[PDB]
Symmetry: D3
């Protein structure tokens, strides 16, 4: 089925330094979404720049924004993983909540585990520290996954609750 | 008080096979709603057919949806229970979330524990598996309860927190 | 296999009145034990005196203990269920913890959810309120299950995680 | 920075009596908010009237509502505390959810832990019991804090995760 | 009843700075123990020295142990509270687990929330950071409570679950 | 310090297929232990038979046990990770609990998440399915880590709570 999608997720340095990795993974395992890849790395500036595209960010935010994003991620630990499921990209975004923790609804990853605002991040010259990245859409997922992951690092296996989600 | 309502709930076979009974019940106990009846059973087709009325499901959806529903429930295990409280029917509906798990809001039962879509269920020709059923309204709760429970299976007792919900 | 067992559990009136049914059920679902029967009822006197047999209780304890068990249970709400699994009788006992809440180890149901002591219950002349009953052994299990359930109320189905516990 | 605020919170007598203090405190600690003051007391009538202002509650509700607020809080236990964080007043309100438990959205403190309605509270003549109070705005927060806390009871320290919220 | 006891608990500066106040308080509320006093303060050196008595700590351990306890607690935030219940002193100790986190049993506060060893702290010259303090015995509890709380700060009220613990 | 240790952990295929990765990881983050490496892979035969060394398994158990272990792990998904901390090897083992789920104490990963017995696994000729592997001792950890990770996959960074565990 073409509705079966893979999405790229990153527990960002704030999530990692706060010990929130298990909490994050569980949110996705609990709804029925399937972890099919995972690795932990220090992000060098080179990879950071390959993940957050300069052209993409400055035409949708600003140059200050993109600079502080690279600052946030470069030479800092992350936990990156791929989630697979029925229309997973949209579902993952729903579970993450709004980009701005101040606005993110309770029950979501960002609404439950973070709170600070854009006004504050702007005022301080730092990036928003919002726990998780998730691919915005299908084109983003397709671009992002190979940036973090080799083909042979994406695993194929059955979760025990598969029939409840995919049907059998 | 007539504001005190009873609502019929079912943890569906997906919820049962996934080991989610306790999770579902705790959601209702935690808010202060009171369990006043419970039974576990294999649903045979006759009962499936009394609960999901042909005329209702076909008017609101289709015959195929009805067929898929009868197939999902029939000869599978459910945990059926009755919840009592102040305007409980509406509150229980809020706690469950939207019918379609893809769109069910995080924090709700269906939002936290399931995720697949109507589009995908149509593609495959199976019912949506959304963990739990709850009576939609007062007329439905009145019809549904006696189908599942005899009068003497509906219990009367006081929860220890009663004065906080019902007042004393 | 002879090792597959069924055991009788009761969430006692203290557990029910405190809104702890979901909590208790989750403990068993989470290790991989399977719920195969459930009912809620107000226990009348003869049922209480069937579950707690005068001769067993006087023998293992005393008459005063029997009387206070009957008082605690009779005319009060319980949620009764049967759990199935590999050597489930011993495993359920382990999860419950020691009879006396004061000494019950943290991590068990009794250790996490109750705390008062035999010394106090004896001083006050009431039963220990320790949240949950479970069959003490195989002979008790075989006696206790049909007191609470008809044969047709014991369910046969497959948990989605069956292969991890029973093997396939 | 001007965006750093303090806000007054009260676990109301219902929350205290229901043993929900820990739950309420964790919600705020978990998002990154900082507890900078805490005390538990029996509220006498005099203090209740300083907290819930007659003129303000009457204009926005009625005299009946105010009397029942005073009756609810007076000579009852509360756990009061102050929360500091970036735009904390708004963030704490989002976390508490709607005044009326019936409509409070799942995920919020009020949505997860209480459920009764305005209609029912009117019908019985008691205040709504919604677990928690939090200052509604900057002005209320500046009035309420000194009513509950002396200046030397507001603590100044660093949480270990400070740099994730305030930056460093 | 002579068995009703009050004990002094302190969430230590490690627990406070790691955002664990709510987690700790919940463990006590959940078993049925009652919070009857609470306050948050920065501990000055003289108070720290009334609580950790030189003669007691040197006789029980060493001068180095007393010194590192004073240094850990002094000028740092604590959340101090009093717990009331049936043999609460012994029960509270069971729930905290062994003094050394390395050996503290899973399920207890120290076991679940900390881990390092006496061996390590001795090497480094610091106190063990084991989250919480609780009175060792009845004499200690009598001595400790007035050091932290005035008599008029110890509250008298009923938990809604009181009849399940004290009986009614 | 000599007491700083790294230990190798594996969420075995049962844990992965059951959606337990988050749960396991949270146990370690929660005590203060630091995740310093992670990957997910399908284990090939040679890697399984390097992790589980024939001679060591035959001496401590038997050839049949070795065979059934290799069948369990080979061509199945795992989540492998390294945990760093003060005497982390012994601590991780405490948190895992007894090898046999039936006996593993409630509070531990194996005790809360699995339950079946050695007697049953031998009866059926399968390996015990106990959710997690962790290095038994320092020699084992030193041998095991490079089998699963390259030097450059082991991360060096500070957790926000570091000062509470390592001291600062
Ligand atoms: N379009 C659909 N496709 C597949 N299954 C459906 C569809 N609509 C409803 N269902 C299934 O039938 C049940 C009954 O439908 P309905 O009464 O509309 O929803 P709800 O149960 O939320 O009130 C749903 O809970 C769901 O399991
Ligand atoms: N119509 C009402 N009936 C009963 N109680 C009410 C009503 N409106 C408000 N209350 C109670 O009075 C408190 C103060 O009201 P208000 O300040 O308007 O809400 P909030 O506390 O959410 O800011 C509420 O928390 C609620 O407990
Ligand atoms: N008697 C047995 N029967 C089946 N499987 C076993 C047996 N003993 C051990 N195993 C499996 O092999 C793994 C390695 O065994 P061992 O090293 O003895 O335990 P541990 O994993 O606790 O170090 C175990 O974790 C378990 O999966
Ligand atoms: O890193 V994000 O594109 O999910 O804000
Ligand atoms: O109520 V019990 O027979 O488990 O002591
Ligand atoms: O810090 V106290 O150890 O004596 O529980």
């Amino acid at each position: 089925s073409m509705l079966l999608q893979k999405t790229l997720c990153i527990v960002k340095p704030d999530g990692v330094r706060r010990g929130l990795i298990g909490d994050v993974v569980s949110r996705f395992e609990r709804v029925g979404l399937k972890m099919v890849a995972a690795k932990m790395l220090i992000v060098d500036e080179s990879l950071a720049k390959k993940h957050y595209l300069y052209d993409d960010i400055v035409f949708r935010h600003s140059e200050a924004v993109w600079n502080s994003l690279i600052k946030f991620i470069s030479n800092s630990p992350v936990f990156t993983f791929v989630v697979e499921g029925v229309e997973s990209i949209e579902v993952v975004r729903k579970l993450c909540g709004a980009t701005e923790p101040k606005l993110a609804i309770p029950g979501t990853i960002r609404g439950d585990f973070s709170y600070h605002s854009f006004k504050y991040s702007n005022e301080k010259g730092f990036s928003i520290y919002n726990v998780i990245h998730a691919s915005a859409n299908e084109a983003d997922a397709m671009r992002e996954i190979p940036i973090w992951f080799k083909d042979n690092e994406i695993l194929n296996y059955k979760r025990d609750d598969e029939c409840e989600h995919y049907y059998c």
